């Protein structure tokens, strides 16, 4: 930061807030600008101006190095709003809301106070953003430029789903042109430093750092950084939006930002509102989530897909902050605690989840497959021993929704199509994961020399973009799809399920259980 002149001295320090007194002549400080407090002869501490009093005392919100801020220290004014580095030189790095790089154990600038696109600067979402989960991609379409909320209780996969969604883009980005590559900005707000390290290692393992940047504001950090982190993150994401590219900014999580802002407001002695929150807590998130949009073709067509996360208490979705966020986003992915603890993960409560604008962006193939799945699931919920066709397919679908890692588009859609057309009717519910693993990774037809298809094989990952083009029901890819599905089902029922139904030895039962555990965790 470039200093211009002294504008006063530090007078009082009440936690994370401070007040300055004017320098001789009252040079003046521009409102909402960044000021530097000379804590040492060579080091400075960032501060944000929030109040210009008549007497000449400036209200400051300390950002970093609060422990080294003392009354009487000189304060210099930069004269400009907060700007942070943005571009391709920040991808793969861990930064803080002030733009400083965070060391990790082995030159464009962006304004963090920019307005959102206006009414005629937007367009309907038309490009899907795949999350890699069958439930979300089918029943909860997410289009690029959409704000999708992720609500749920503590320890229910709220962070895991978003991290997997970021990871799911690695394979796609490496194949298609760089213009369509989806970049990610994971913003951690008030989380634990160990959790940030684990997330960083997980992203690095899958090579997602080339297309991802992490902004961290741990719980030990003051409220200013936590309150400012999401704005800096979206600012980093808006760089690609204004240049015809797409981003996937993620906020983990807005609840802690609200707590930090409430702390700041109460330290300033402002009228508390509902649940002691400030009156403008809604505006806090409004000015944030509004900046994520899908630009119109005239502006380039860039996008910023927001995935705000919110934590509820006892599955209470009538909280002040939860309802406020639900009133801003374009949907919600509710993660029920009962499903999660019951072994049904990611535990997406499809009944309460919804996508208000993502329906159009859904791909034609996924849209075609997902149309009937909606009715099947709706009937299955109402029906829950007479087992009709809807009940069998509903049970198989619920079994298939169990995932740990994001699934490639071709594998997920092929498995969903096979289940929808009744190819898993004879397959027992407990063997659905093993059946899917054999379908995706192995190839029974080739193994037993009974393959007739010319090109349609699951080992040909190149077919994903051909399936995405027309449909799974096109006359080009329909006959071979049906042939391979029939052969796989026949071979499975003949060889694998028949033997699995004839296991009584205790050792063999343990081996079968271990096999099922392994399959359930790997496709």
């Amino acid at each position: 930061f470039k200093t211009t002149e002294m504008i006063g001295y530090v007078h009082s320090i009440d936690g994370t807030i401070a007040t300055l007194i004017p320098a001789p002549g009252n040079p003046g400080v521009a409102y909402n600008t960044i000021i530097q407090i000379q804590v040492s002869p060579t080091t400075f501490a960032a501060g944000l101006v929030f109040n210009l009093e008549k007497d000449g005392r400036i209200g400051i919100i300390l950002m970093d190095n609060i422990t080294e801020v003392q009354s009487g220290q000189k304060v210099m004014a930069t004269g400009q709003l907060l700007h942070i580095p943005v571009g391709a030189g920040v991808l793969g790095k861990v930064v803080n809301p002030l733009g400083h790089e965070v060391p990790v154990g082995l030159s464009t600038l962006g304004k963090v106070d920019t307005g959102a696109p206006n009414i005629v600067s937007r367009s309907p979402v038309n490009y899907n953003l795949l999350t890699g989960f069958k439930a979300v991609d089918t029943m909860i379409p997410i289009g690029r430029g959409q704000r999708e909320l992720i609500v749920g209780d503590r320890q229910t996969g709220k962070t895991s789903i978003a991290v997997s969604t970021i990871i799911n883009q690695v394979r796609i980005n490496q194949q298609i042109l760089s213009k369509n590559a989806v970049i990610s900005i994971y913003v951690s707000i008030g989380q634990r430093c160990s959790n940030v390290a684990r997330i960083h290692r997980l992203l690095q393992s899958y090579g997602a750092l080339r297309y991802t940047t992490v902004m961290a504001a741990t719980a030990a950090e003051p409220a200013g950084l936590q309150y400012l982190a999401p704005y800096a993150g979206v600012t980093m994401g808006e760089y690609f939006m204004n240049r015809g590219r797409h981003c996937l900014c993620v906020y983990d999580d807005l609840s802690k930002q609200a707590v930090a802002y409430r702390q700041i407001s109460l330290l300033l002695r402002r009228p508390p509102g509902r649940e002691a929150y400030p009156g403008d807590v809604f505006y806090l998130h409004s000015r944030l989530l509004e900046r994520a949009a899908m630009l119109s073709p005239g502006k380039g067509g860039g996008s910023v897909t927001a995935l705000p996360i919110v934590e509820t208490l006892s599955n209470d979705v009538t909280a002040y902050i939860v309802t406020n966020v639900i009133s801003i986003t374009d949907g919600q992915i509710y993660l029920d605690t009962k499903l999660f603890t019951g072994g049904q993960r990611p535990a997406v409560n499809i009944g309460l989840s919804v996508s208000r604008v993502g329906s159009s962006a859904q791909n034609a193939a996924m849209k075609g497959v997902a149309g009937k799945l909606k009715g099947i699931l709706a009937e299955y919920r109402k029906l829950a021993q007479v087992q009709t066709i809807p009940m069998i397919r509903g049970a198989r679908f619920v079994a298939l929704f169990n995932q740990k890692q994001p699934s490639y588009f071709m594998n997920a859609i092929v498995s969903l199509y096979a289940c929808l057309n009744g190819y898993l009717d004879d397959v027992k519910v407990q063997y659905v994961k093993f059946y899917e693993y054999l379908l995706v990774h192995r190839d029974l037809g080739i193994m037993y020399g009974t393959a007739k298809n010319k090109f349609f094989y699951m080992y040909v990952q190149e077919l994903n973009y051909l399936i995405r083009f027309f449909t799974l029901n096109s006359p080009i890819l329909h006959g071979e799809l049906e042939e391979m599905l029939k052969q796989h089902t026949h071979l499975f029922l003949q060889h694998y399920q028949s033997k699995m139904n004839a296991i009584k030895s205790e050792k063999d039962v343990k081996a079968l259980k271990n096999l099922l555990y392994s399959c359930k965790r790997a496709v």
């Binding site: 521009a30 009414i119 403008d280 505006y283 639900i326």
Partner: protein
Amino acid sequence: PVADHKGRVGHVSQVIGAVVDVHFADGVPPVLTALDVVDKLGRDEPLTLEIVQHLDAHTGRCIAMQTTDLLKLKAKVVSTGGNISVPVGRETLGRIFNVLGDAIDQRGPVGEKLRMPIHAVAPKLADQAAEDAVLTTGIKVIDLILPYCKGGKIGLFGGAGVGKTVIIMELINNVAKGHGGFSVFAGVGERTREGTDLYLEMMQSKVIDLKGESKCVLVYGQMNEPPGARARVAQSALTMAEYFRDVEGQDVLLFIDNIFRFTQANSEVSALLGRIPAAVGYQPTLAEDLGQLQERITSTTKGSITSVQAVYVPADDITDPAPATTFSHLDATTVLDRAVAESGIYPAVNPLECASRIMDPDVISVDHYNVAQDVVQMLTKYRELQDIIAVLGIDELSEEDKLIVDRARKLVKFLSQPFQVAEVFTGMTGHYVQLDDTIDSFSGLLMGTYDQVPEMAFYMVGGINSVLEKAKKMAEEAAELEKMRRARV
């Protein structure tokens, strides 16, 4: 004439949030006066202030319509010589405006004949109208239990994601498109994408013919806007509606979404003005602001304004001061409940908590009134019985109580309807039920002539004919299943 304070020079004395105090050497201009900041300040957009209080004979407290970033003390400010004025007339039709009345659609200049201030006095007693009519919306619940009145004030109360916006869009499609008069859509603190969707829908349906004659005006101050603009966009839109009503004697439709954000913005600015908060934390002048705003939304002897307003209920707390104060300012009240929505019933109207002013035999037909009253009584008794049912069970009821329960369940299912705008979410073609058809169907259902029809036949359908067709299809499916089971022997 020219104001005696136009061009008056003042200097910024204090800046706190969106509240700025300006000192005038020659005297503070009148309250509500619009001021412009002349200093460049390196800003990207101009800055405008509205006077809301007088601190002394020289200092005045103002609210900024744009962000106050890069605003220094002693910054020069010049009075505009009057309140904030917005364009009026037919030149505004088909255009998109903001709080200040600037066209934001990136099209040619408005070229309005004149402008009028956003702040105006409400109509007096002698100017009130005495006309009562029925506005057919095509929705069974509204047309039956809480019928809307032409030229009246309507409100939709609901939580987050309950269906307020969907009902507004359905009403727009079913009324505004086939409306003789003009329409004004005032977006207050709502999603900006919704404004774009509404604009595209209007253009596609030729409601806004940029190459021809349009019949709608869009005024939008959205969530991203600062609290200053969200407390005056409603005033500007209502000023345009008032001009259409009075200066032309034209029937107008005023769709406000959401009116709660107006009170919220007023509370936010009041917190900075240095006022003692009322209960919950709203400004002490909550009732007065709503009274001044709503009293202007009325039908006079010159024209008519049918206003539909969406009221947001924070945390689903219907007792909150903001929504609570709005009830007294509405002719028709539509209360939406989250629990009803979670049960698959859309719209989620809670008929027992809804009310209408034209629910009077002197206004609506006698048969309509009798059917509505019978339905309400049945629903009330069923709600009373549900308390016993949820504890002991249905089998612990009287013989006639079971009949009441079955009829009330069919009524609850029947009240649902698929909207033509929610086809994506419902996956079914929307229905438009005539007023007479609704009355006849509900009267028949009350008599009990449809006791044989399955309960689910009434779920997500239109009139009685749709119920019978769905029942026939269900009967055919059941017969097929029975034939398959019998052949299995």
